[PDB]
């Protein structure tokens, strides 16, 4: 039971990394769509600064 | 990790290819359903040249590829062309040729 | 306890060449048996021999060899459009003792120089364009020419400095060595500060 | 006199290293859209790109 | 040991375009020496060669090839003497070199 | 017709001991042989490597 | 409760002198006998023969 849970949990990480979630985008914090306290946003092709 | 950086900078596509490969769309299958000779042949340019016309509102007939609008204004065979081309058979054969 | 200020830092002279095509090129595109290049820093002489296999980089390496690290190098690929390169050099000596100077001449059996103006015009090729204020057979002189440009002055020679509560002192180094019974200190900005040992 | 409108609700504003602009009502969005700033609460922040 | 400094403020674009053409754009022709048109991105390239392939669309499409569309906009699609589209745009990315 | 180009974006280049660097885009891997540096937005830095 | 401003540096009588080629330099090696000097500092008087 325990080990199967380990494989299930490990299996999830394997599942997680199957996804190329990481994308070819410049990287910065903040993307909320409606009524956040505040956010300035920039995107995936910017000259980095 | 330097290898991880290497492969991505070397080639992200193959690097993604290890996790996944590519985005998949629905198979592009659709039909021009009804065409026959003599439907618009003289609004079409059955004159051989470009003397005939057909009515349209702009964007009544157009291609979109890569979200960019694409062209419908030359023969794939290279002869005289218009958006309302010579004949029904010629226009639609040229596109497949295109 | 005490109050302090700092109003100099003992940074070094560092100089650079013009935008060369590259330092893989040769001290000049072609050479005689030799061309000879001289440097000085705080009264010490540094001389190098060029040969028909000496790239500009080989010259930088020989300068380190001939100086034995007394004059230090750091080189640049500027990455600028079309002309991505510079060549630069650094002194060992620092502070009020920091300065560098530049000359070209070959040594003789007396251990003495002979002026290689052919090698002197190599310096302007290497962008350390000689500051002409040196009528010198360097053995007696030991000041070579400076250089001509300030943007090519990667870093400047100057002293270190500070006060202590009523008193002002200048120092060849940013390392304050013996402030007390087992003390040492560094200078990091030109500013005032106060301290206590307790 | 303006005093009868209590404390006179008005714009919401910010500053971006010498760049500024005014918007309050229902939204603060059109600040040169495409990369934009929006305001609901007092804040201070810095970012860097990767 | 060394000093590096960085002080330069990035900025954004505001924009309204000329329109994308309908299915007709005849303009010009070639010369004896091959006439070449090309569109760039700070070091890369996007190209067409002119023998008689010399329409507005040939050019505009490559402008789309170079511009890449990493932009935000709101849409109008009406027409102008064979030009179904017009838009107001504002930048999604950065750069002066990127002009 | 930069008038269609109602407003324009801009970049950030960098300076160095003695030097300033022309660029087509932000990158300072061209310090020399592989030494890689990156530019944040506004500041000076004095260096030691240890 | 109290608020403080401080406008005046408490200082000492800080001297530093002529530059010496030699701290071991002689203040006097063959003084014509002795001299007689007097000082007051720290609210205290001083007298010496040199």
Curated annotation (Swiss-Prot), chain E:
The protein's assembly and partners: Homopentamer.
Function: Required for the morphogenesis and for the elongation of the flagellar filament by facilitating polymerization of the flagellin monomers at the tip of growing filament. Forms a capping structure, which prevents flagellin subunits (transported through the central channel of the flagellum) from leaking out without polymerization at the distal end.
Species name: Campylobacter jejuni subsp. jejuni serotype O:2 (strain ATCC 700819 / NCTC 11168)
Family of this protein: Belongs to the FliD family.
Signal peptide residues on this chain, from the entry's feature table: none
Encoding gene, per UniProt annotation: fliD
Protein name from the UniProt record: Flagellar hook-associated protein 2
UniProt subcellular location: Secreted; Bacterial flagellum
Full-protein positions shown: 100 to 198 of 642
